[PDB]
Structures are given as structure tokens and as C-alpha cells.
């Protein structure tokens, strides 16, 4: 635990990046979290929503 400050900074940055990448898996109330699925499944009037 001598080098905790640098490891803390690296862990915080890596964790925040992980959180960002993980947020793509959430649909936020939509039918799917994948844009390709929505574009391949729906007409533009509902795919827009």
C-alpha cells in the first residue's frame, strides 16, 4: 500500500471508463440497447422514438 495514490488514480479512471462502457448495455426504457437491432427491426417513425 506504499503506492496507493497512483493506484487510486489509475483505478478511478479505469472504473469510470468501465462505467461508461457498461452504460451502453442499458436500454433506458427502449426496446433494446443495440442500435443495429432497432434499425433492423423497426420503421423510421418508431425507430426514431
Amino acid at each position: 500500500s506504499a503506492l496507493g495514490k497512483l493506484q487510486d488514480v489509475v483505478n478511478q479512471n479505469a472504473q469510470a471508463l468501465n462505467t461508461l462502457v457498461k452504460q451502453l448495455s442499458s436500454n433506458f426504457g427502449a426496446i433494446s440497447s443495440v442500435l443495429n437491432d432497432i434499425l433492423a427491426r423497426l420503421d423510421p417513425p418508431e425507430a426514431e422514438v
Binding site: 420503421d43 423510421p44 417513425p45 418508431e46 426514431e48
Partner: protein
């Protein structure tokens, strides 16, 4: 834009609708501005034969 359609097809003259005359006869844009007017014409646009 003037035309004659069926009684049940008046719902299809709208943005974002799935239908037969919507796809192959008259299509409205998703961002359409304006008004649709429909009135019965059985007295004038019908014949007994």
C-alpha cells in the same frame, strides 16, 4: 392534394402509418405539417351499377 378513398382507409392518411394506400398510393412524411380533410361522397361518387 385531392383524391377519393374508402371509408376505413381515412386512418391511413397520417404520418407514420402502416397501410396499403399509405405505402403504394399516397405517403405522408414523418414531419408533415398541414390538415387532412375527409367527407362522405356517397351521393356523388357512387353509382347503382
Amino acid at each position: 392534394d385531392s383524391f377519393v378513398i374508402r371509408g376505413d382507409e381515412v386512418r391511413q392518411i397520417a404520418p407514420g402509418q402502416t397501410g396499403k394506400i399509405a405505402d403504394y398510393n399516397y405517403k405522408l412524411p414523418d414531419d408533415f405539417t398541414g390538415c387532412v380533410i375527409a367527407w362522405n361522397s356517397n351521393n356523388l361518387d357512387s353509382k347503382v351499377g
